[PDB]
Structure 1
Amino acid sequence: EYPTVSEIPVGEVRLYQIADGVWSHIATQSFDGAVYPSNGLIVRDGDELLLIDTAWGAKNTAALLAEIEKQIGLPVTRAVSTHFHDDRVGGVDVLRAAGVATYASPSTRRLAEVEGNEIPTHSLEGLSSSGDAVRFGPVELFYPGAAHSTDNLVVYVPSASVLYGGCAIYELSRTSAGNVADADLAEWPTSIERIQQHYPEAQFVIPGHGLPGGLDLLKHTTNVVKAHTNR
């Protein structure tokens, strides 16, 4: 039922409805000789939509906007990028040209600039210290501490008990650490503990890549990170 990597051609974007007014968006990209899936989120905010993360590149993000218009038919008015990598900000310029207001923490905007990646326009305040949470429209944004990257945010949809972990959370089928070049391996398990403590009621946990599950994905990610640490 959830679209798997093997079922989405590069260039196309699938929407998967999780709850009333909550969808995930799924895209793919070929990278370094393999094909990877990538998740983001769409949350209804009255008669508008909040987007979480691009669809990993300009072409996919243009397709994402077309697919949202076709399937949902409400305007995407704001988008938040949850860290500075290309699977989260790549496509920000597309969103901006289409009139979407793009947002990220000041730490994400800085790291994207250093990396030469696309830079969301607006700066989200109130997320600079581990454990910080702010409401943004229909979601809560939470900075759990450094993990997959120094700047990674997670997103919670209280009306639906959906926790979007982004790339700080691994799918169960991923048993080796991924891209950890920008990670804080030492802090990542403690950051995951903060997520668990703040969102114990979550019913649907979405990783940045791959299949959703429950809160077990948090301990799974800790296990994989610790294994990599001891490599």
Structure 2
Amino acid sequence: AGMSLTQVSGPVYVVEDNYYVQENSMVYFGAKGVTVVGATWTPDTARELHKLIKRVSRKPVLEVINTNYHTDRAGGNAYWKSIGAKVVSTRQTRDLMKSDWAEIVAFTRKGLPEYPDLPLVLPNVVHDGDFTLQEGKVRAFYAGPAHTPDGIFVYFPDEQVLYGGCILKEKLGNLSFADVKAYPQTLERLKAMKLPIKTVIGGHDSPLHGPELIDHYEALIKAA
């Protein structure tokens, strides 16, 4: 289908969003409500994800995290705000979105002319540091610049699942916004945290991998 939502471990689900360039995002089904990690490409793809969420749980969608300021992680924001969900990001992501949204939309449309000219929709919950949701079961952190200056990781300690949004994936992908020399330093900072990881979900290409996706991508970026 256009979008799928599949259980990875317990309350942790992976979204495969096949619109435009395939992007993978996360959903966490909590006791009081649902957290979406990555807003998906557009308001219409966000509505498609909501439809799948509502076949799994009746609990409200409480918040959606923009793991960077780009279209594939924040494009759905209009829809999520419209249904009362908070849109959550770091201060750095929010500030880059304000100044650079028009630029990323135009860049996205160069490769994907069919992609809509979406108006700016900013996060309404903004964090100055690392942060958690779902009583500490969803943990968002910054470990330096990589694919964009602002990209964050989201870790799910109970399930030992790491999501890196656009940072981790199978193919080199698009480096036009990246800090190529810092990229492996950020991945090494991440590895030095020694997080128990069983599963890494890539933000593009096939989602399900083990911890070695980090090493895979590190080696690719060091050759770029």
TM-score interval for Structure 1 and Structure 2 normalised by the shorter chain: 0.7 to 0.9
Specify whether residues 123 and 203 from structure 1 end up closer, same or farther in structure 2 by C-alpha distance, changes over 3 A only.
Answer: same
Q: Does residue 148 in structure 1 map to residue 135 in structure 2?
A: no
TM-score using structure 2 length = 0.86
- Cα distance in 2 for residues equivalent to 1:200 and 1:95: 30
TM-score using structure 1 length = 0.83
- Cα distance in 2 for residues equivalent to 1:221 and 1:118: 31
Secondary structure in structure 2 of the residue aligned to 1:29: coil
Select which of 49, 52, 61 maps to 1:64.
49
Secondary structure in structure 2 of the residue aligned to 1:224: helix
- Cα distance in 2 for residues equivalent to 1:27 and 1:180: 21
State the partner residue of 1:17. Answer: 7
State the partner residue of 2:187. Answer: 192
- Cα distance in 2 for residues equivalent to 1:77 and 1:200: 26
Q: Could you tell me how far 1:39 is from its partner in structure 2?
A: 0.8
Select which of 133, 158, 163 maps to 1:136.
133
- Cα distance in 1 for residues equivalent to 2:128 and 2:6: 30
Cα RMSD for the two superposed structures: 1.4
More strand by share: 1
- Cα distance in 2 for residues equivalent to 1:23 and 1:217: 19
Identity of aligned residues (%): 27
Contact between 1:27 and 1:37, CA under 8 Å: does it hold in 2?
A: yes
Q: Could you tell me how far 1:54 is from its partner in structure 2?
A: 1.1
- Cα distance in 1 for residues equivalent to 2:203 and 2:194: 17
Q: Does residue 218 in structure 1 map to residue 214 in structure 2?
A: yes
Letter of the 1:204 counterpart: T
Contact between 1:25 and 1:55, CA under 8 Å: does it hold in 2?
A: no
Secondary structure in structure 2 of the residue aligned to 1:167: helix
Q: Could you tell me how far 1:88 is from its partner in structure 2?
A: 0.3
Select which of 43, 48, 64 maps to 1:79.
64
Select which of 200, 207, 210 maps to 1:205.
200
State the partner residue of 2:163. Answer: 164
- Cα distance in 1 for residues equivalent to 2:175 and 2:204: 14
Q: Does residue 46 in structure 1 map to residue 31 in structure 2?
A: yes
Once the two structures are superposed, the pairs formed by residues 109-124 of structure 1 within 5 Å of their partners are 109-116=94-101, 117-124=120-127
State the partner residue of 1:227. Answer: 223
Contact between 2:168 and 2:217, CA under 8 Å: does it hold in 1?
A: yes
Letter of the 1:220 counterpart: H
- Cα distance in 2 for residues equivalent to 1:199 and 1:47: 30
Farther off after superposition, 69-78 or 215-224: 69-78
- Cα distance in 2 for residues equivalent to 1:118 and 1:178: 25
Structure 1, unaligned runs of 5 or more: 1-7, 31-35, 128-133
Letter of the 1:17 counterpart: Q
Letter of the 2:122 counterpart: I
